Amino acid sequence: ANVYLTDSYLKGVISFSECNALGSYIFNGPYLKNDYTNLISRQNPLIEHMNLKKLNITQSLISKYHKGEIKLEEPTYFQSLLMTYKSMTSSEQIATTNLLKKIIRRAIEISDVKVYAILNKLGLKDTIKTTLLKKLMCSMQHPPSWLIHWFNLYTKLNNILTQYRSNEVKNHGFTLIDNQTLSGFQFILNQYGCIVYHKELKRITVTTYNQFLTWKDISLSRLNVCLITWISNCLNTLNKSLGLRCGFNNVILTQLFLYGDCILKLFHNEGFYIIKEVEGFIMSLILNITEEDQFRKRFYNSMLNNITDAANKAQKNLLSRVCHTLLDKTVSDNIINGRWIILLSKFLKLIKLAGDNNLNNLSELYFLFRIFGHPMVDERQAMDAVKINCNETKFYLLSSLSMLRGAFIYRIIKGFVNNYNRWPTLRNAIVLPLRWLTYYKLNTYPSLLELTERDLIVLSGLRFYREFRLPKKVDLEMIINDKAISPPKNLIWTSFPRNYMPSHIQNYIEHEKLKFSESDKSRRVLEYYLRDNKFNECDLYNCVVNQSYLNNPNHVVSLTGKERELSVGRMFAMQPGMFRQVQILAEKMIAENILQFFPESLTRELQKILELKAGNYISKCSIITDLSKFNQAFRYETSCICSDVLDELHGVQSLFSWLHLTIPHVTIICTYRHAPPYIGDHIVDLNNVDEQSGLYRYHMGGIEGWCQKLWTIEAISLLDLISLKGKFSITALINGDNQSIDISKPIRLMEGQTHAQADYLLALNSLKLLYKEYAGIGHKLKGTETYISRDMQFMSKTIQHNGVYYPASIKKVLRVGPWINTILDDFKVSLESIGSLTQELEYRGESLLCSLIFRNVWLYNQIALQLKNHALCNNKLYLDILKVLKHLKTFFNLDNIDTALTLYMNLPMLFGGGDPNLLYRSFYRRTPDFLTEAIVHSVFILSYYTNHDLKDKLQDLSDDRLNKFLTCIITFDKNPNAEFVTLMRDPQALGSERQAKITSEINRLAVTEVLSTAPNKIFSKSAQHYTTTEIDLNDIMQNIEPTYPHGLRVVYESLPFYKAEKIVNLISGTKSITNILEKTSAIDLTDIDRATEMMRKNITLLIRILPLDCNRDKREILSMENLSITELSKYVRERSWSLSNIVGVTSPSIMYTMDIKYTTSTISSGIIIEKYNVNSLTRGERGPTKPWVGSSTQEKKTMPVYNRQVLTKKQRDQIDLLAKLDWVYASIDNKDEFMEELSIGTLGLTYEKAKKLFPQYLSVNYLHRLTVSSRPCEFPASIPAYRTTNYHFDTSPINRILTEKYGDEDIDIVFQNCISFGLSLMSVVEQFTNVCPNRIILIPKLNEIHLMKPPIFTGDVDIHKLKQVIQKQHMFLPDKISLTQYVELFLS
Amino acid sequence: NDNITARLDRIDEKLSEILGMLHTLVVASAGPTSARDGIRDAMVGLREEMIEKIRTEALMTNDRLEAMARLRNEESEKMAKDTSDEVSLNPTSEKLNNLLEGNDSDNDLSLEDF
Amino acid sequence: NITARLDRIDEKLSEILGMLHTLVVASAGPTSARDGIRDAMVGLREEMIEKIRTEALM
Amino acid sequence: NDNITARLDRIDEKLSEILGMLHTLVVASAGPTSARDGIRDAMVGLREEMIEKIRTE
Amino acid sequence: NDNITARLDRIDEKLSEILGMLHTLVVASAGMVGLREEMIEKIRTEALMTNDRLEAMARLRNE
RNA sequence: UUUCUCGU
């Protein structure tokens, strides 16, 4: 049948409603709050709740509670109890200590291979070979009691969770009873509930599976923090610069976690109001350290006010809620006594002690925001707050509205001028005065300093024609998403359980279901679009132009609790399919057309953003304000006045104004499986349902997510008006919910004043003005949201000043465990996710060994100690891993399976290994090709077991382990299949079963078959012809002699199969395939065993890649004398694909081909790199040089002179793709007919007509300046932006040598990776030697250098197959350029 | 031709007073009607007239004093407190600051309490 | 002097145009969309004109 | 001269547009659910006459 | 020179009636057939001008 | 167990 797999991480919402309902049904009384939820749960319970209560142990527990032996308590109370376990015994403590010691020792053993490779490649200076790791292991012998406690708690909770998940996989409706795993505790954990009972303390509760996952994640996060801090301290003990930037004794951290749990327990669920201020408090200490006298005290006092007001509000809400409920006898006396002041003061003082007046410590303390857990969001309370905020009348001065609209108009005019060199076409040219008419005629614009309030008022009254165009064909990639939607107004009750609905409501639903189509009856986007049999391609366009969303009788907005959000409230909402289409279309057009007029929107890294942003007296300032609640302050009169500008520009009525035209008339209703509203009798529609705390009407406001870009651009216009009114410059960096301001205004400094006490006055005046105009425009932002600063910049929850970045690496790597970011408990995905998450430590905190050892700890845990407990298949992966270990031991001369496991862990993941991130990632992020990097990583790894200098290239050696490995990589049996289409899907693919298969390739088939039998004609035909189109697209270009994978990728992108396969790949990532249309959230056994066999084959890849007999049975092996790794990899790729010549993808590994020398000689011939800052520890200090972005070389193309705005984004992208096609395939025998029919099929133009539209390129080499989406565009260093500023680089000797040898020709190597590798290598040398080198030079190895001249293709693309593939996939082509659109491309 | 200038000074001054009326004109949002059940129009009227309407409960609004102050263009005490050069502390915050900046007298570094 | 004063009168009239147009735009609201007069208030647009044109030509 | 004539020859359309804005505001403001049907069927007649006029010529 | 004076008189009358319309507007909003017909005519002629502009590029295509 | 839930 179908199996239910439950996630091991919450990745969802802890729901107050379901917990209250379950507790109320179990204890026959109001459990959490006196709402209708408890009443309906006690009246007509759910089947799962009945099953949970009917258990004999549950009956005994409720009988004991009724007898008064035990008293009901709260999930927060038991969270505190679990955190302060205080129930360990000597036996389990010894076992946990031994397990942790073994884990640490094995991780250090695995790390030794990587470190030895790094060291002997760098030239610096039993089971462990390096003295550094020897000392590190000798120091990290006994983990401390706090570390052991956290590890033991996490291990016990994970054991309970994995046992429950395995049993749930085995059989459905399982409930796990475990009173033995945790001493003194008791768990009745199920998917629909988790009852925790403490026999010793006589306490009981009702919790949820999400709450249990949250507890486990809290334990895992504390374990991660403890491990990272312990490793950093042990590294810093032996080398100050080696470890992380922060320093903790971690007794303070453990006490801080305990005190946070105590605060939560004292304030019950409402304690997260207080907990929400930890990040702000850290920021307050940061400002105390950095800012001037006035700003620091202002923020400190204001936020003391904030914290105490939040605590008082939490206490009041707690007392109000707890009164008429079963928990009334639970409130601690210290809450009423007011003694919680002492506890909270202790918490803050210990937070400050953890900070230790150190900027790095405070900056990285931002993980406390996530350690303490997540609240159980109350839907009714947050919706009541939203109703109170939104359902109010806002009074505006007509002057203020005119100024805002005029500012938006001025932004539109400035953007149009700067982009298309002309004013937009506007109807009302007569309303302008003579001056503005002259500015219209002479197509320029005035500056802000030369513009006035009169000008803003005048510009308000303008009406434009069309400059932008609506896409006629709906964008399937835009609308298709795995997310969910809401049913219509008459079907909204289907989102509630049948038991919770009244009998007449159930009858109405059963009668109405037959009156609705199969599509809208669903609740998921995929099901809604697939079941839509009567789905016309031009449906969204027709709806938008007919305003069908306006006054729709079946429009209802449903809003559910946020996911993993500690912020109370923040209730995101859903909307039916058609209105969602309209909203997403409006957002897409805003982003792709108008957002180019507002560069401050920051649609994006932070650090670069900050770095281009960073990029008698002048007074500066800085204001940071929150905008999470802004969205609520925008009526029709303030948002649609600027939305009318976009409406006119697109020439469409009420497209961007749909919000405050249809949301007011719909009913805002709570929608959750355990939060139903009271209906009554004979009422079957929301418009007649009376409103209560669960639902309301007449929103008069915005919604989160929807129209965020519109409100962002309106805010930017508002700040431009602010700057005009205040006579100062603004450098806004608005992004998402956080807004950053940088006001600079020249002043005449009066006598006896420094730069201080004038920036403060500027800040106060600007804040008063800013407050005044937000009040006038509707927003009532308080002192809670905003604050002022002078030399500090805050955005995206990041800390920096003086150009030195302070990261949050520990927070980023907080949740790392066995199966993270995976679906169906995928092994390879978990490995990749662990690797990616652990890089962050060395990418942001500048610590190679800390990140590497943390990654090795968790990788070893997952491989050895967690594969045996896989949820789906019990032991198959572990058995296969054991087989691979024995195979590796037999292949090499490894003495022990322990060493075999170490080698497997260090072996690159490309050849079915166990190392997710290779060596190059530690020196430069992006690489041209992965095969060469994998090969060099494997060579360096094998250099541990085979003595190699790594400084003398690769002189042959007596040992034959590396020789055998390389020979076996070279020699294999070729089994090509669908080679060209596989290259077009992945230009770096190997094929012939010589690379790890990702889940998309396996799932593509099953996706095809499930899509073929779908009601939607478009998807049905696309899947029916999918195999034939696959064959045709594979053999379309089998005749070209020199195959170019990147040019093939360009062809594939240009052809309409790209969108269809994007949809297929998106569908392949869902939980269940062939069960999408079955109306069930249970994975099919077909999915289970297909994924299982794919996982087993991926695990058993090293065996096939490395046969024991190294294939050919002879003494002839790969001779290592004068061997080029680039040639090796190119030959491997060509042999694997059975292709005569593959060009353009083979690039040298810079790490291998660039040697390291710290002192010059008689010949330099190297990339000279020196540090400008003359000091030992350059880390944490900013230099005088521009940051090393490492962008690729700029291609040279000429923009054709035509009207850009009249062509849609997809049409322009396809035109650019065809221009790239002409650039790459200019030398084709069949080029004329190929491009002619390609243009006829795709666009509405011919080749001759479209040639003038094509931006003809000027670079003669398409192997060096091509811009394929499969090729990297930037080559940055591993170190962040600021650290790259401390060094200078020069490549003049390299230029001289490369011109002397094979000069005046392009080279395969990339110099951006060269510079990034040099900088990151200098940083790594500083880490490993406690001193940054004065000057470093990189001598290359010329045998890895190749001349990648542009080849002349010889062949004929099969026009018949190209016609067939376009005709079959005729439902995915972009908008054809009609004549009535093309004829205006050459006007003025 | 001073007669035409003298006779257009009148239209100039009445256009100026129309501009002043437009500047003093105020517009309200199209919020829900009284006792719900419908959508009220986005009514527009003279400034002081709608301060009188707000103070006479003609339109329900969460903000009365500060809305009135903003409409009449006067500095309100709430706005001054939000944009104060020095911000004070409520008694809870004063006690919190006293405990934070003072030496640990009780030294109640015990989880068994509270 | 007469030209400059006529120009300043033109600027005031431009301000009247702008303020009245802003009031027209802000005065539609959801109440006009519910009653189906927003299109009359703000004006017919090019997409609706194309819809009418293609309905005629069909 | 012609400058004053051109100036008033733009003032007349400026005032006409002010008139039109006042007309639409006053017909949309007054008449609670009374004239709304009038504007609705006026739009119906307008679209009918527009499509007929596009059919002609 | 009386043409300028007559133009000034008619624009004065138009502006005075404009002020009358603002006064009636604020009075009505606080607490029609010809006006409606005139604004239908205005929107109709605006739509006609826009449609003629669109037919300009239509004719340009048809060439 | 109105597809456990899973927005932009």
Author numbering:
A (entry chain A): 10 to 134, 183 to 661, 666 to 676, 690 to 1462
B (entry chain E): 128 to 241
C (entry chain B): 130 to 187
D (entry chain C): 128 to 184
E (entry chain D): 128 to 158, 170 to 201
Verbatim from the authors:
The respiratory syncytial virus (RSV) polymerase is a multifunctional RNA-dependent RNA polymerase composed of the large (L) protein and the phosphoprotein (P). It transcribes the RNA genome into ten viral mRNAs and replicates full-length viral genomic and antigenomic RNAs1. The RSV polymerase initiates RNA synthesis by binding to the conserved 3′-terminal RNA promoters of the genome or antigenome. The RSV L protein consists of five domains: the RdRp domain, the capping domain (Cap), the connector domain (CD), the methyltransferase domain (MT) and the carboxy-terminal domain (CTD).
The sequence of TrC10 is similar to that of Le10, except for the base composition at position 4: Le10 has a purine base G, whereas TrC10 has a pyrimidine base U. As a result, in the TrC10-bound RSV polymerase complex, we modelled the first 8 nt from the 3′ end of TrC10 RNA with the first 2 nt (T1U and T2G) in the catalytic pocket and the other 6 nt (T3C to T8U) in the template entrance channel. The T1U backbone of TrC10 interacts with residues R637, Q640 and G779 from the fingers region. T2G of TrC10 interacts with residues A541, K619, F629, A630 and E778. Among them, the T2G base of TrC10 has π–π interactions with F629. The polar oxygen and nitrogen atoms of the T2G base interact with residues K619 and E778. The remaining 6 nt of TrC10 are in the template entrance channel and interact with more than a dozen residues, including residues E620, R580, Y13, Y249, R747, S1155, E584, T551, R555, K570, E57, H229 and Y249. Comparing the TrC10- and Le10-bound RSV polymerase complexes, the visible 8 nt of TrC10 RNA correspond to positions 3–10 of the Le10 RNA. The twists occur at positions 3 and 6 in the TrC10-bound polymerase structure. We reveal that the polymerase prefers to initiate RNA synthesis at positions 3 of the Le10 promoter and 1 of the TrC10 promoter.
